[PDB]
């Protein structure tokens, strides 16, 4: 009932299981159900420069004629340098989180400048998203993929590296706005048994669930590990796709529904 929910909301703690169960029965509204969130890799794509960014810009300009895109940017090697300096000083994860946000901001600015003449803007208030996505002439926005947690960043179990970075920032935006899919555009064909750059016998994994993926005990992954837990708790985005942006057409085929690369399912 709504009467039951409204009575619990005013008389009980928000931690009350009865209130939590009543709120779970509420209707589910998707804010941008026809939109797709994509992450342009930071260290994996944008840090490669023109040879990787320019073909993807062409693919994005072509893809936006058919698909509404929220284009999030990674951070990359400049964030790792900032993390190294700050970690050497013993600064907490909340301070490192703000430093990493600036790097993703830089990448969003550089990508947006290459898309400005195509009408695609760099947005960052929340408010500029509605007009350009609706316009078929635009149909896309660029945003910085770092979460807004800042000094309120939840620290990892060990170390000062912020556990929620540009993978989580992009995914949570896709989940919050009820987008239909989340595509990570990086520099490998997908998830492997191990880091393919340092493990030469790594095997490509075309599809896996979060439970099976955590069962593998991977030493390294193409996505932030906390995103796997966010994926299992997600209400709208119940799977993510990882594709190789260095191969032309991979992003377009993923938007068309092809299972290019790796699909990681929550269930």
């Amino acid at each position: 009932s709504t009467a039951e929910l409204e009575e619990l909301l005013m008389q009980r703690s928000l931690t009350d299981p009865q209130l939590q169960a009543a709120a779970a029965a509420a209707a589910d509204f998707r804010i941008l159900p026809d939109a797709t969130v994509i992450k342009i890799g930071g260290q994996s794509v944008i840090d490669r420069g023109r040879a990787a960014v320019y073909p993807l810009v062409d693919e994005i300009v072509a893809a936006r004629k058919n698909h509404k895109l929220l284009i999030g940017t990674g951070a990359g090697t400049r964030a790792r340098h900032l993390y190294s300096i700050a970690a050497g000083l013993g600064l907490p994860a909340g301070v490192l989180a703000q430093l990493g946000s600036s790097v993703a901001d830089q990448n969003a600015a550089m990508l947006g400048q290459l898309l400005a003449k195509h009408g695609i803007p760099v947005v960052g208030g929340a408010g500029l998203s509605a007009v350009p996505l609706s316009l078929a002439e635009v149909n896309a926005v660029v945003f910085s993929g770092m979460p807004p947690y800042k000094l309120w960043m939840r620290p990892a179990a060990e170390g000062v590296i912020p556990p929620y970075r540009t993978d989580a920032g992009c995914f949570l935006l896709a989940e919050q706005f009820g987008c239909k899919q989340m595509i990570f555009v990086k520099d490998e064909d997908g998830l492997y048994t191990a880091n393919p750059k340092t493990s030469k016998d790594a095997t490509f994994i075309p599809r896996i669930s979060v439970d099976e993926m955590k069962a593998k005990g991977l030493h390294d992954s193409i996505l932030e590990f906390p995103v796997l837990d966010l994926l299992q708790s997600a209400q709208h985005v119940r799977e993510v796709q990882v594709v190789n942006g260095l191969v032309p057409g991979n992003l377009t085929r993923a938007l068309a529904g092809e299972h290019v690369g790796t699909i990681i399912t929550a269930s």
């Binding site: 090697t77 190294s84 907490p92 309120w152 992954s221 708790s233 997600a234």
Partner: protein, 272 residues
């Protein structure tokens, strides 16, 4: 297409997901940014009681200004429950309800700060708290802010109710700063085995001391966010947080001096 342009750094080329590769660089305990800071979280439901509760607390806070360097953070209260009722009726997701509830915590902060304006206390914004708290606590003895964290549309999914609320945000701030402590000001004496105002209040037994891990294994309701117990497990500095009754004058003053007048929650932080 062509090679990644790296900046030479101890974390260069790394994905940062390999704990064995990141530990030599970042695996150490962080420093304390503001070790002399005391953080006080005022419950939204305490503010909801109006002048009958706010005026005595304002007088107690006034007498505490010459004794401590205070960051005062306010919770949301009943008004966030109404925006939840409307927002959930409209079907809005959890990342939509989080900033709407935070707004009520901010309004409570403006109200509390106005009562202390003649003492030099003002409400300060989240970016000011995150980056300029040191200079503001050098200008005046205390500032007021919103206890909610700026998670916004990046709030965690799962529950339709935002999990990172006022208790959680206040502790994330206090522990990130390495503050001397966090005191949570409640409308009850502390944590009980059941809701002391609910249908099973006859069974409610007061808990003078508890651990965050023991509370996280509970299932019943609590006067603090369940996410607070989660961030307490990964805390770095604050070893204990006391929940005291702000409706009893003197308990906040006693708690800031380490006196046991409420429920002591042991975090996961350790040693001498």
């Amino acid at each position: 297409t062509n090679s990644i342009k790296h900046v030479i750094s101890p974390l260069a080329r790394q994905t940062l997901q390999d704990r064995d590769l990141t530990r030599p660089v970042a695996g150490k305990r962080p420093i304390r940014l503001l070790p002399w800071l005391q953080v006080v979280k005022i419950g939204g439901r305490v503010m909801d009681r109006g002048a009958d509760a706010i005026l005595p607390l304002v007088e107690e806070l006034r007498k505490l200004l010459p004794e401590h360097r205070l960051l005062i953070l306010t919770g949301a209260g009943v008004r966030a429950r109404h925006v939840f009722s409307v927002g959930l009726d409209l079907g809005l997701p959890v990342g939509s309800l989080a900033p709407l509830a935070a707004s009520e915590a901010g309004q409570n902060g403006h109200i509390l700060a106005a009562m202390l304006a003649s003492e030099g206390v003002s409400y300060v914004e989240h970016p000011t708290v995150a980056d300029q708290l040191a200079i503001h606590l050098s200008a005046t003895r205390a500032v007021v802010g919103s206890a909610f964290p700026p998670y916004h549309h990046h709030e965690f999914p799962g529950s339709r109710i935002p999990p990172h609320r006022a208790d959680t945000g206040a502790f994330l701030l206090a522990d990130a700063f390495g503050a001397a402590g966090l005191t949570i000001v409640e409308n009850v004496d502390g944590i009980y085995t059941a809701d002391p105002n609910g249908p099973d209040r006859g069974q409610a037994r007061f808990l003078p001391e508890t651990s965050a891990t023991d509370l996280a294994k509970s299932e019943g309701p609590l006067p603090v966010d369940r996410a607070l117990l989660d961030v307490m497990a990964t805390a770095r500095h604050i070893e204990r947080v006391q929940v005291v009754n702000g409706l009893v004058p003197g308990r906040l003053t006693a708690a800031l001096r380490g006196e046991h007048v409420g429920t002591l929650i042991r975090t996961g932080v350790r040693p001498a």
